[PDB]
Amino acid sequence: MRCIGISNRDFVEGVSGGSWVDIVLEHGSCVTTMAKNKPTLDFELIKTEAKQPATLRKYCIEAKLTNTTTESRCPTQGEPTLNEEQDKRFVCKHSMVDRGWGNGCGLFGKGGIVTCAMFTCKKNMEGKIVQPENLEYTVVITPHSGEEHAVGNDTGKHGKEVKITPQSSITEAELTGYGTVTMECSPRTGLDFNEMVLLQMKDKAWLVHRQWFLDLPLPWLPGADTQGSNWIQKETLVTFKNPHAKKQDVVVLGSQEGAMHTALTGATEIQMSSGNLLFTGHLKCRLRMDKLQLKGMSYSMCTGKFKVVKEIAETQHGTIVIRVQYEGDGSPCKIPFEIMDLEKRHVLGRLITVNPIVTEKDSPVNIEAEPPFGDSYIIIGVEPGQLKLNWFKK
Amino acid sequence: MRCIGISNRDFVEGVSGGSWVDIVLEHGSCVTTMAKNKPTLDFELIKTEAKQPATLRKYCIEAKLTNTTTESRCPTQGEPTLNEEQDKRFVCKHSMVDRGWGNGCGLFGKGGIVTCAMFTCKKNMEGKIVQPENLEYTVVITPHSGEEHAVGNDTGKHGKEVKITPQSSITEAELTGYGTVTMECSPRTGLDFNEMVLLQMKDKAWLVHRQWFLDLPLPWLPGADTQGSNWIQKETLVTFKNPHAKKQDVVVLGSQEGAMHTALTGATEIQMSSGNLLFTGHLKCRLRMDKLQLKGMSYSMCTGKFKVVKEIAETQHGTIVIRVQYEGDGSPCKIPFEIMDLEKRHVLGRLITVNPIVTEKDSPVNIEAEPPFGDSYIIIGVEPGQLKLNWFKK
Ligand SMILES: *[C@@H]1O[C@H](CO[C@H]2O[C@@H](C)[C@@H](O)[C@@H](O)[C@@H]2O)[C@@H](O[C@@H]2O[C@H](CO)[C@@H](O[C@@H]3O[C@H](CO)[C@@H](O)[C@H](O)[C@@H]3O)[C@H](O)[C@H]2NC(C)=O)[C@H](O)[C@H]1NC(C)=O
Ligand SMILES: *[C@@H]1O[C@H](CO[C@H]2O[C@@H](C)[C@@H](O)[C@@H](O)[C@@H]2O)[C@@H](O[C@@H]2O[C@H](CO)[C@@H](O[C@@H]3O[C@H](CO)[C@@H](O)[C@H](O)[C@@H]3O)[C@H](O)[C@H]2NC(C)=O)[C@H](O)[C@H]1NC(C)=O
Ligand SMILES: *[C@@H]1O[C@H](CO)[C@@H](O)[C@H](O)[C@H]1NC(C)=O
Ligand SMILES: *[C@@H]1O[C@H](CO)[C@@H](O)[C@H](O)[C@H]1NC(C)=O
Numbered sequence: 001m002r003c004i005g006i007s008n009r010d011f012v013e014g015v016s017g018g019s020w021v022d023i024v025l026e027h028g029s030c031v032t033t034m035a036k037n038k039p040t041l042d043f044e045l046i047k048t049e050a051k052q053p054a055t056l057r058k059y060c061i062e063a064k065l066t067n068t069t070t071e072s073r074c075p076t077q078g079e080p081t082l083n084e085e086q087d088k089r090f091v092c093k094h095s096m097v098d099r100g101w102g103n104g105c106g107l108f109g110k111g112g113i114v115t116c117a118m119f120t121c122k123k124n125m126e127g128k129i130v131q132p133e134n135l136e137y138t139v140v141i142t143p144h145s146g147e148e149h150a151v152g153n154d155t156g157k158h159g160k161e162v163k164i165t166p167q168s169s170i171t172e173a174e175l176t177g178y179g180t181v182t183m184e185c186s187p188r189t190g191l192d193f194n195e196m197v198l199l200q201m202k203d204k205a206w207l208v209h210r211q212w213f214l215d216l217p218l219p220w221l222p223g224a225d226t227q228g229s230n231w232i233q234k235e236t237l238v239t240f241k242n243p244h245a246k247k248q249d250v251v252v253l254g255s256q257e258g259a260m261h262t263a264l265t266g267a268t269e270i271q272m273s274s275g276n277l278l279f280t281g282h283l284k285c286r287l288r289m290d291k292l293q294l295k296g297m298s299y300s301m302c303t304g305k306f307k308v309v310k311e312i313a314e315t316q317h318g319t320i321v322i323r324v325q326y327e328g329d330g331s332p333c334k335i336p337f338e339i340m341d342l343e344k345r346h347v348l349g350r351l352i353t354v355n356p357i358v359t360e361k362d363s364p365v366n367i368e369a370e371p372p373f374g375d376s377y378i379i380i381g382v383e384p385g386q387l388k389l390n391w392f393k394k
Numbered sequence: 395m396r397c398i399g400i401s402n403r404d405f406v407e408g409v410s411g412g413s414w415v416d417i418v419l420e421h422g423s424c425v426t427t428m429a430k431n432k433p434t435l436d437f438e439l440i441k442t443e444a445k446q447p448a449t450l451r452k453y454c455i456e457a458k459l460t461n462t463t464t465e466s467r468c469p470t471q472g473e474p475t476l477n478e479e480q481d482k483r484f485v486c487k488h489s490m491v492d493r494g495w496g497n498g499c500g501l502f503g504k505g506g507i508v509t510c511a512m513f514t515c516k517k518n519m520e521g522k523i524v525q526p527e528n529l530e531y532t533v534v535i536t537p538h539s540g541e542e543h544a545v546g547n548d549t550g551k552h553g554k555e556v557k558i559t560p561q562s563s564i565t566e567a568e569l570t571g572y573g574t575v576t577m578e579c580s581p582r583t584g585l586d587f588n589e590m591v592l593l594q595m596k597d598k599a600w601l602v603h604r605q606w607f608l609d610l611p612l613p614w615l616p617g618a619d620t621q622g623s624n625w626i627q628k629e630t631l632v633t634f635k636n637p638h639a640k641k642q643d644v645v646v647l648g649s650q651e652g653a654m655h656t657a658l659t660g661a662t663e664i665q666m667s668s669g670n671l672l673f674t675g676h677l678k679c680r681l682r683m684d685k686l687q688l689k690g691m692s693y694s695m696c697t698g699k700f701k702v703v704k705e706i707a708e709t710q711h712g713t714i715v716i717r718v719q720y721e722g723d724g725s726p727c728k729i730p731f732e733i734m735d736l737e738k739r740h741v742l743g744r745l746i747t748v749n750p751i752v753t754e755k756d757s758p759v760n761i762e763a764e765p766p767f768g769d770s771y772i773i774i775g776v777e778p779g780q781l782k783l784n785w786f787k788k
């Protein structure tokens with residue numbers, strides 16, 4: 001009954017005869033499955049967690065230049081040389097400056113120069129690759145127990161959590177009391193997982209095109225990196241200025257954080273809490289309910305009368321939910337429940353929460369029925385005090 | 395002699411007769427002025443400092459969201475309300491979420507919501523407006539004294555520093571020993587100063603178009619601001635997400651520092667040290683040298699012989715510089731110096747450092763002459779030991 005109250009709720013019914021039903025889940029969605037002489041169940045896909053992707057690459061989006069040093073030579077004295085010219089943490093550039101008496105040389109002319117500054121990354125992205133094979137989809141199955149606090153309760157303490165993997169065959173489900181049901185799940189994500197890379201920025205984390213990712217004009221380190229200093233293309237964030245041949249300067253290009261966001265507009269976002277993300281993927285599964293069995297078809301209809309505990313409420317999908325309490329002595333019994341017509345002649349509606357049964361003189365029961373459009377009557381209980389609440393749909 | 399050794403060096407000669415000469419300065423440039431029976435002078439424009447512009451506006455390029463709070467209502471209970479909805483430091487957004495039994499309401503339907511988060515700026519730009527009238531151009535005048543350490547010496551301790559302003563009439567120049575010269579300067583900058591705004595980012599500071607500046611999609615405060623909290627358009631850096639009608643989130647758009655740089659590519663850069671900038675502007679001035687007079691035309695040519703102290707060096711502009719020392723007893727006397735021809739008959743070159751004179755038996759003298767293309771002979775001194783150094787130009 002977890003679905004009762006969710007906007008994006010899909011109702012799925014069993015193939016007339018065959019106790020097999022196909023459903024589709026996706027974060028922000030809910031599915032209420034029904035099947036002849038079978039408990040009504042609610043399925044929701046909690047989380048979709050990639051186990052441990054691989055760091056394809058690692059871009060630096062903000063750096064600091066330090067320990068700047070420079071070497072120069074007089075005209076006709078060959079190129080300058082700096083040891084740092086070989087230190088992978090340093091970024092260097094050769095250039096030329098005017099030289100003459102006024103500044104150390106006996107000759108006037110363009111003299112060679114070379115400047116180096118130590119590049120230290122301050123913040124970095126981290127593109128990653130995920131393989132559908134290793135995607136553990138968690139799914140919570142909440143049966144329409146009718147339990148007092150079940151309606152819309154998203155605690156989890158009402159359904160049975162089930163872990164699933166495409167590379168884990170067909171998984172089984174133990175529904176404490178109803179038996180067992182089995183799910184035949186297959187990946188079937190939105191976009192390809194090879195052409196797409198999982199980019200991450202301390203919190204916001206998208207999913208972009210492999211190529212676009214790699215073409216990013218930013219200092220980077222190959223995934224297999226551990227050093228975290230020998231950045232490739234350090235100059236994509238470093239600029240060398242020598243305007244009047246006097247001196248040469250090295251500058252930082254400042255944080256690219258926002259620029260990345262600004263460029264990840266069309267990209268596919270993906271909320272994620274340090275490892276448990278909430279993707280976008282139609283996770284299809286097949287349901288076998290052969291081992292599933294109604295609860296207590298060994299009980300007898302109740303004879304006593306019921307007291308509406310919580311007034312009939314209509315859901316965003318035309319269904320109605322009502323809560324009632326049993327006052328009869330019957331003890332563990334079934335609740336009479338029909339959606340008759342205006343004259344109590346025929347039947348016009350169906351129970352969504354199939355086979356309603358009281359379990360304790362003092363535990364109210366929640367029932368979700370689906371009345372027709374227009375009028376109908378919700379007839380609950382039997383003759384002595386039979387509630388005959390009227391209703392109008394859509 | 396400060397110009398000797400500078401690449402961008404312009405030689406300016408006086409209008410045959412009139413002792414008035416027009417020169418143009420700009421950072422990274424140098425001008426060597428000459429005029430019949432007048433000392434040769436070198437002009438360089440040290441700095442161009444705007445006195446105190448006005449903060450047109452102040453954009454925030456990096457912010458932090460804090461103290462998030464939210465109010466919500468059940469279906470058919472009117473809009474939610476937050477006190478912060480009125481606190482100018484807070485950014486808020488109304489929205490809708492599904493509600494029903496499972497989460498507090500007796501009805502199922504879209505319930506109103508409103509979320510607010512306190513916006514705190516962390517880093518900011520600061521566009522500014524400058525008016526030409528108040529631009530104090532500093533200019534250093536270094537005469538061709540011939541002084542031992544003058545060639546290319548950029549210490550300043552050789553020339554006389556002169557402050558100048560368009561709104562300061564015509565300025566006078568006291569050249570200790572040569573008399574006085576006067577400069578008639580007029581603004582004449584590159585671009586207009588109304589259509590352009592002086593943008594600044596902790597060091598890097600450009601000059602962009604007023605409109606483009608103001609159209610920047612960034613939180614901002616009117617220049618006259620002192621508060622520094624009631625930012626306008628805070629949402630240009632704040633995003634509200636409510637994907638599944640469950641909850642609504644507020645997020646920061648992260649630093650725009652680099653994005654601004656990346657967008658200030660075509661813009662006009664402007665190095666600046668906390669107030670003293672180095673602009674781009676052809677500062678034209680007119681020179682009156684009437685009160686200027688050659689030095690020591692009361693001395694007599696030396697008779698002794700000279701010793702080349704620093705070998706003849708050629709500059710990036712065909713001129714040659716030589717340093718010699720006097721060994722004669724003559725004391726304060728003039729140095730004989732001519733650029734004769736291959737046969738010591740006629741004259742082929744001119745002195746740039748006009749009227750060379752020794753001043754101390756032990757103080758070498760620097761002379762810059764301009765020999766012709768091809769051969770010529772630098773004849774220094776007189777008969778007894780007259781140096782006859784030969785030379786080849788270009
Ligand atoms: C969502 O579900 C949680 C937990 O579900 C269990 O609730 C119990 C009562 C039972 O129905 C079991 O089958 C469910 O799995 C609900 O949390 C429970 O809340 C109730 C009432 O708020 C608590 O019961 C007791 O009530 C008496 C009143 O006479 C008090 O004196 C007791 O101190 C106690 O509160 C119970 O302790 C809670 N148990 C847990 C696990 O938290 C929750 O109320 C429900 N909410 C929704 C969405 O309806
Ligand atoms: C650029 O100019 C500075 C200062 O200019 C003055 O230099 C003095 C010498 C004189 O010519 C005056 O008219 C100039 O305005 C030069 O700095 C000076 O350097 C000299 C030599 O390096 C120093 O002179 C002395 O030399 C004797 C050697 O016998 C030593 O024993 C003394 O200790 C002393 O060094 C003088 O002190 C310096 N003065 C100043 C103000 O620094 C500088 O060398 C020159 N450089 C270039 C670009 O050529
Ligand atoms: C960088 O410069 C600092 C400050 O002078 C010094 O302490 C440090 O040892 C230098 N480190 C490197 C890598 O050059
Ligand atoms: C913001 O929240 C902090 C942490 O609870 C609190 O100390 C502070 O007083 C709050 N300030 C504002 C402006 O709400």
Ligand code: NA
Nearest residue numbers: 738739740741
């Ligand atoms: Na002749």
